[PDB]
Amino acid sequence: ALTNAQILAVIDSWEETVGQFPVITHHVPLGGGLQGTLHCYEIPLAAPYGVGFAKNGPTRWQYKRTINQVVHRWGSHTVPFLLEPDNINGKTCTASHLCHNTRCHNPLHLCWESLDDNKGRNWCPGPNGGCVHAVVCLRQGPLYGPGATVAGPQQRGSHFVV
Amino acid sequence: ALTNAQILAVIDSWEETVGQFPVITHHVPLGGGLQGTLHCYEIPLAAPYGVGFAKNGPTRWQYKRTINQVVHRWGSHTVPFLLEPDNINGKTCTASHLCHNTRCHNPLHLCWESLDDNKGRNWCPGPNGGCVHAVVCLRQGPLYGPGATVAGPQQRGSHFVV
DNA sequence: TTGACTCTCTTAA
DNA sequence: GAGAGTCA
DNA sequence: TTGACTCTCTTAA
DNA sequence: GAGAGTCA
Ligand SMILES: [Mg+2]
Ligand SMILES: [Mg+2]
Ligand SMILES: [Zn+2]
Ligand SMILES: [Zn+2]
Ligand SMILES: [Zn+2]
Ligand SMILES: [Zn+2]
Numbered sequence: 001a002l003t004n005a006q007i008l009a010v011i012d013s014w015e016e017t018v019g020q021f022p023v024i025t026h027h028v029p030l031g032g033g034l035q036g037t038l039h040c041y042e043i044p045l046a047a048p049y050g051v052g053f054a055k056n057g058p059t060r061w062q063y064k065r066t067i068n069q070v071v072h073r074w075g076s077h078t079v080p081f082l083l084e085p086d087n088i089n090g091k092t093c094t095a096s097h098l099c100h101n102t103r104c105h106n107p108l109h110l111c112w113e114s115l116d117d118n119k120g121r122n123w124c125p126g127p128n129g130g131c132v133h134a135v136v137c138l139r140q141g142p143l144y145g146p147g148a149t150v151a152g153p154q155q156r157g158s159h160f161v162v
Numbered sequence: 163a164l165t166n167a168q169i170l171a172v173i174d175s176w177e178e179t180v181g182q183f184p185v186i187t188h189h190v191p192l193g194g195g196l197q198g199t200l201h202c203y204e205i206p207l208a209a210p211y212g213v214g215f216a217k218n219g220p221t222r223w224q225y226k227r228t229i230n231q232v233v234h235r236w237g238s239h240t241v242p243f244l245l246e247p248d249n250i251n252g253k254t255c256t257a258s259h260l261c262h263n264t265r266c267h268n269p270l271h272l273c274w275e276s277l278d279d280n281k282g283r284n285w286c287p288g289p290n291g292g293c294v295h296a297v298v299c300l301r302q303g304p305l306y307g308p309g310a311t312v313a314g315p316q317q318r319g320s321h322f323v324v
Numbered sequence: 325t326t327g328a329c330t331c332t333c334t335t336a337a
Numbered sequence: 338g339a340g341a342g343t344c345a
Numbered sequence: 346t347t348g349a350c351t352c353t354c355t356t357a358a
Numbered sequence: 359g360a361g362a363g364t365c366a
Contacts, residue, residue, distance in 0.1 A: 011318055019321025039323050047349055054349060060339080066346055075339060084313045092355080093312050094337080094338050102337095102338095108324045112313035115338060115356060116284075116305055119337050123282040130292060135311035138324070143278055149297035150255050151246045151274035156173055159181030161201050162270045162300065209328055216328060222360080228325045237360060254334085256358080256359050264358095264359095277335060277359060281358050 001067035007082045010065055010072070014079040017050045018043075018105040026099065028139035031129015038138060040104035043076070059102040076105060081112040094118050098138040111135050164229060169244045172227055172234070176241040179212045180205075180267040188261070191302040193291015200300060202266035205238070221264040242269040256280050260300040273297050 001007065021041040030036045043049050043061060052063050053076060061076035074082070077095030086093050096118035099109040113135070124131050126140030153162075164172070183203040192198045205211050205223060214225050215238060223238035236244070239257035248255050258280035261271040275297070286293050288302030315324075 008318070015317060015319055015321050019319075041322065049348095051347085054347090056340085056351085062340085064347080069346095071346085073341080078339090080316065081313050088310050088312050092339085096311075096337085096338085098315065100337095106322050106324075107317050108315045108322050110315055111311050113309060113311040115337065117309040117311055118338070119281065119357085120285040120305055120309070122278075122337075123285050125292075130287075132306075132308050133311070134308040135314040143282055144294075146294050146296040147275060147279040147282070148250050149258075149273050149275040149279060149295070150250050151243050152297040153260065153270045153272055154242065155177060155269050156170070157177050157181075159177050160203065160268050160270045162268075211327090214326085216326090218330085218361085224361085226326080231325085233325080235362080240360090254360085258358085258359085262358095277358065280359070281336085284358075 001065075001070075001072050004083070006067055010063075010067075010074075011079055011082060013052065013065065014063055015107065017052060018107075021050065021105060024104075026101065028099070029126060029144075031126030031131065031140045031144075034128045036139065038099050038109065039106065040099055040101050040109060041106040042101070042103040043105055045103075077110055080107040080110060084112050088114055091115070096121065100139070100142050109138065164234065166245070168229055172225075172229075172236075173241055173244060175214070175227065176225055177269065179214060180269075183212065183267060188263070190261070190300075191288060191306075193288025193293065193302045193306075196290045198290075198301065200261045200263075200271065201268065202261055202263050202271060203268040204263070204265040205267055207265075238267060239272055242272055243274040246274055250276060253277070258283065262301070262304050271300065 024040045024042045026038045056062050062073050063076050063079050064073040091114040093112050094115050096111045096113050122141040122143045124137045124141040127137050131137040186202050186204050188200045190200050217223050224235050225238045225241050226235040253276040255274050256277050258273045258275050284303040284305045286299045286303040289298050293299045
């Protein structure tokens with residue numbers, strides 16, 4: 001809600017609830033042929049999810065609290081960042097999973113960045129493979145690799161140069 | 163159905179027409195602090211665009227030919243790949259700009275790959291900066307770099323571990 | 325047969 | 338990656 | 346007040 | 359990154 005105190009209270013209530021979610025160990029590629037371990041705090045697959053939480057999409061949740069007798073609601077992963085600017089360079093800030101695990105609500109696995117920065121982590125070589133993200137990746141992106149391109153650049157005649 | 167010969171004729175007429183688009187020289191990052199040159203064949207900003215071409219969106223065009231009284235229409239960048247498989251690993255193939263310039267229709271700047279592979283090129287370090295794409299990038303992706311993350315992983319209490 | 329517009333759709337963050 | 342409404 | 350559902354939206358390839 | 363309709 002409006003006051004800093006009320007916002008800190010929301011963050012603290014959220015952390016306490018999420019902190020009771022099951023802690024799931026995930027072994028992940030780091031890049032450079034190395035492997036690490038992340039501890040995700042995973043929201044349950046079905047109701048009940050936890051105090052204040054409700055599912056609005058297959059992998060979308062929202063946190064809600066009643067403050068000043070009014071319901072205040074936020075995307076489940078946005079709560080840690082309620083005191084941060086909500087935009088950067090005119091682009092909306094998004095919650096962004098460093099563990100690439102939607103159900104995870106561990107704030108140590110979240111950052112707050114443009115959707116472009118968010119998406120780009122999917123292809124990052126990872127913290128031991130050359131990640132250059134200023135807020136460093138926790139793992140190699142799940143889509144990192146050579147790809148599966150079906151056909152490369154080509155011409156039939158002689159009209160084009162690279 | 164169109165025969166192979168008819169498809170080749172469509173590809174040839176498309177190449178003939180695109181080869182008369184203005185050829186624009188662009189200096190581009192290759193990765194590793196190196197600069198290179200790409201020559202894009204750019205569709206005009208407004209009509210007329212060229213024989214067979216029409217704009218269906220701000221940065222979307224289609225190529226249309228009438229063959230034996232039947233109107234055939236394709237996405238304007240898909241024509242080079244009409245003799246290729248249209249899916250791979252259960253995913254639809256997309257035209258993918260290696261020059262990241264939608265107006266460009268240079269087939270030497272296009273490949274044919276999943277939308278995920280396509281998007282991921284936006285963040286690639288480039289052919290001189292560590293590109294691992296099997297069909298190599300022509301340039302560093304426009305979104306490569308440290309990013310502009312507003313807030314990193316953080317907790318107010320001690321409920322979490324990474 | 326052709327040009328120049330119009331509309332909505334897909335994907336996965 | 339989001340916001341908001343309908344019920345009980 | 347709290348929970349458990351429903352719906353559509355945003356972005357940029 | 360796509361497909362398809364209207365009109366002259
Ligand atoms: Mg993400
Ligand atoms: Mg692309
Ligand atoms: Zn996690
Ligand atoms: Zn990274
Ligand atoms: Zn080009
Ligand atoms: Zn590449």
